[PDB]
Amino acid sequence: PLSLLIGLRFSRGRRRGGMVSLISVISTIGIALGVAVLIVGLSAMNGFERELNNRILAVVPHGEIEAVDQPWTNWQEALDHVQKVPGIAAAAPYINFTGLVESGANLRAIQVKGVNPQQEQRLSALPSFVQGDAWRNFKAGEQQIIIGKGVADALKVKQGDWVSIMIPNSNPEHKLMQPKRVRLHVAGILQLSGQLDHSFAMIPLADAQQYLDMGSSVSGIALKMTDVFNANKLVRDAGEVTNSYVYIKSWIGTYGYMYRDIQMIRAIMYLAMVLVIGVACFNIVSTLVMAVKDKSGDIAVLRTLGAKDGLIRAIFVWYGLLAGLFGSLCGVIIGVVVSLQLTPIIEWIEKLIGHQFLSSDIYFIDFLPSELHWLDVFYVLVTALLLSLLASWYPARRASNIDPARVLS
Amino acid sequence: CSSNAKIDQL
Amino acid sequence: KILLQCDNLCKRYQEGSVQTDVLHNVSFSVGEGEMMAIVGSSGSGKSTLLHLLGGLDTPTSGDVIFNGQPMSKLSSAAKAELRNQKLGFIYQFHHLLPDFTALENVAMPLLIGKKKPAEINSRALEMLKAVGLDHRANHRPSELSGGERQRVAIARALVNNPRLVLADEPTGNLDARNADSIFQLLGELNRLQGTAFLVVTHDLQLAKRMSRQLEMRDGRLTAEL
Amino acid sequence: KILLQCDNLCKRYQEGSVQTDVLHNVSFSVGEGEMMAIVGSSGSGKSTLLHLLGGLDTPTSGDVIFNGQPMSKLSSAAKAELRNQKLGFIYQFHHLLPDFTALENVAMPLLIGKKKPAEINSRALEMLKAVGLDHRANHRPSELSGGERQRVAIARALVNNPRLVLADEPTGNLDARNADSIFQLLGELNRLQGTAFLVVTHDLQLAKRMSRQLEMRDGRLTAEL
Amino acid sequence: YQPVALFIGLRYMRGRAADRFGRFVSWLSTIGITLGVMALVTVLSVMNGFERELQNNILGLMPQAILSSEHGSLNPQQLPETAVKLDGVNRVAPITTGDVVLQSARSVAVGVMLGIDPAQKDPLTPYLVNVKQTDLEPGKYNVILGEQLASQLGVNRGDQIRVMVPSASQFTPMGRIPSQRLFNVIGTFAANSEVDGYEMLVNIEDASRLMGNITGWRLWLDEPLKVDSLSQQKLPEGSKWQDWRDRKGELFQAVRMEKNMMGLLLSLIVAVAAFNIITSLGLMVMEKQGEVAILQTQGLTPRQIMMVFMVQGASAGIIGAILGAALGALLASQLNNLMPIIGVLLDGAALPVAIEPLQVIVIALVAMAIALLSTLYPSWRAAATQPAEALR
Ligand SMILES: *C[C@@H](COC(=O)CCCCCCCCCCCCCCC)OC(=O)CCCCCCCCCCCCCCC
């Protein structure tokens, strides 16, 4: 069901000349160089957002309600008020301990916290990233400790080794008497994405009360919320039921800057590829104006046969789209074989240069993911065709004003 | 990335 | 009873930054079914005379009155569909599209005017049977001989019942034995629907076959010279 | 004593499964100041012969010795100096540069030879003065007539005292009254400076103004075959 | 009329069409390189402004390189300040380093010891919040803690802490005991950076480490972007080059890897624009095949006719890189000067810019190189072909 505006101009592109066979090769390569890299460019941006909800957002609590330098003697009634908040899923207490480890003539910054091992699987995905066989051995009364992956590289210890950490004394008077060192044995290590490997440790809540020589008193209250895009309003109203004012915080001020840097690339890479396809559509203009002056005899034939102005103008519109559609669809075939198989590609370059990039020290992760979305394929297809239609519209207006009586008809 | 500020809110 | 009324159509052409009058005070009457002939020298302006009566050039002095409608009052789009089923153009420089075949080349006026799809392969293949090129319809004109591809453009415009065919040297690039095959076919269309056509050549041999005998030399004639 | 000694120029360009000869056993002799003419059918090799005397192609069988210097021993850079002031080429297909004017088109061989600027503004305009195109020096050839722009390429190569003016159909697309007036101008260079030229055409009536009226019929010339 | 026989036949091949649209088609190769440079220098200018402010708050507050010995400490009487004349050094100051650990009545912390001389000028002195530099007396053991360091430790002014050195420990035959003394605090300074959480100002004369001498000398550099380039120069004997690459060797190295990824993605604009020269000149030869055989008949070597089409592919690269660098430097400097023209960003951090003059010259020579190597293939096809066997 071919229409009249497109016509039968598929056979017009099968021209024969000199070096014109090489011009058609570069015209579909340079216009696909900005399309095939934009599909794999936005694939890694979706992979960074997918790994954030499983390795970053699922391992830290959202809302943190601490105490302003005071031991909470009535923290049992505060857990019932935060649980009935319309928008808070669960709640669990935690005690912050600012201690270090001194084993093997080294110095590492570790942040150990006291969480209940029976209630840690209801607010965060913390024990789902342990390299050990199980984690149910975290009972009360045997001095357990579990460290990260970035601590064992400096201490050179494995599962079953006794280590000595620095535990501060909770003296009521401001004085120093002696440092406290308690021998603890590790029962396996855990791995995380790229940040909380050398500064993460956990102790049970029943084993943390004997270090402060207290009874039943915690310091902070952790929680988990359903919606994560609004983490500033759910923390303010949840702290107005315990006392007058406490120190409130969230994951926006310490981990929420990654969403600003991910969305900034989408506002830059998509803006940069406008100028890439914009200078790639100049190849269509250089082959459309060149296709007018040599084939100007066939334009004067159709004017003598009784063609209107809209018919002789729409010929070169669909003629310039044939060189663009073959190059735009050539980037979709490359865009699905590189994005779906990116993990054998990035690892292949790192083992031939000598040094690998994207280290797991201050970055997000160590590997490079790619989550191909079919909605972004339709967005890049219409964007490459909208610039090709704007580039072929202006030579189509020039070809509609050719005098048929000037050329020898 | 490389654009960090480290600004907290009490 | 008049088809085309031409009076004082002086055409000026820029020849060396000066609008020189190559034609001046031309008077030519076209009748319904009349057989006329135009003869002249190569340079008198007989080749560009078909462009003034067709609508390709601008009538800067005068107006061509075709069937009682002046083409000067019509717009650019109003002269498009008029030159599809009422007028025809036959040239001698072999102005055929090499991308299409011989069957789709003669069906090109049937596709512009938005005709029916059943009428496409019903009035185009029968014109090749009259000339004698129906067995070479699915062929390319670039690989043909000299006199075989010239007969395709003769019956190209004779597909949608024309009224005035503006021929320009029809016996240009074919043999003399095949030159009379398209001339015996043209005598049948006046007995079929009653159409007229004028023939513009240079020699005096094939011009005497028409009824009205008149010349055209620089637009100056009274009776005969 | 002699200008060019041609001896057994057998050439085979591309055609056929095996390459066939369009010129064979050609023993031509060009003298200083003598007038010759070459006639023949268009396609026999009369147009492809002129590429071998100037040095544009490799003959691969025989040697072309012009003024005692064989072109086979010279390189491509050495033939550029030979084809600047010793030979000239005049064609018929209107191969002129449309970007330049008529004055700067005839001064194009005067610029590649690294001449002084005093010879640029003196030797160029005197050639259009002789042919009668001095008032159209600062004009574009794209807006000229048919016979006006054809006379530019006739006096284009005659600017640096040529010796063998190779002409390929000088009477191509211009007026017949203007066709012999440049031949009278060509017929005056022998008594002022002294040069030789050959006119290659397809008719005997326009080649009767030369001394040694020869021919070329499929590369087999003895006297008048 | 030009005296050069090669550039005379090309001044009319770029403006042969006196139309409103016919002149824009032949100048399409200029805009492709102009828009490719101005989208490269402007974007890399704000990336250099991020690296400029990162060094002024981290590397501008810590010692970059220390000239310490390989046998432990360094005697100041053997290596004075007159025999340390190296390249890039403008000021030599005595300093000591070392990994230390805090010990307070509430919690512990991490940090490195930074012993300075109070009789010399220090850049941390405007950042001292009501703390005089003369209070750091030898024998008093006064420690000036940081803003973020004392905020999480709970140590205010007029308190007493304990600093232990696990690295420089006395290897006693009876066991392993670290050296530690009693230390009191005098104040808290703030600088609005990240180095305040692990750096304190103590006296230079201390007995917590080994041996009264120092460990090395603090040196300042004019450009700290090339520490690895000057790491292989002539050093005096009895010394070991220790730079900041042992601790901060992955932070400032991470910024240089991001410039090789953004700068290579933006280099695809001139890569496609270099492919436009092959198509603009590849189609120009085939439509001007009759003008090539005229120059061969009038007299021209094929070596010089290759250079004719080289100018058409190099004229767009010369004027395209100068105009692209002029508009690229004007957009970066006038970005947030008069009015925001790129959009109101929700940051509010007063985004700076840094235009390096050496970076503009190396970028413009790249666009003049890839535009010249892509011209050799359309220029060779117009010279390797036969003048008479092609069309006439
Ligand atoms: C931390 C990130 C982002 O860092 C930044 O801050 C980027 C700088 C912000 C730029 C703002 C510019 C504002 C003004 C714009 C003016 C434009 C003018 C245009 C002309 C009018 O670090 C990064 O840079 C992330 C880099 C990620 C790169 C990912 C793509 C790499 C793809 C592989 C390379 C191509 C391979 C091709 C193979 C054929």
Ligand SMILES: *C(=O)CCCCCCCCCCCCCCC
């Ligand atoms: C700051 O927000 C930390 C970001 C950590 C990840 C930085 C990744 C930079 C390189 C991104 C490459 C994307 C394209 C990959 C396919 C070519």
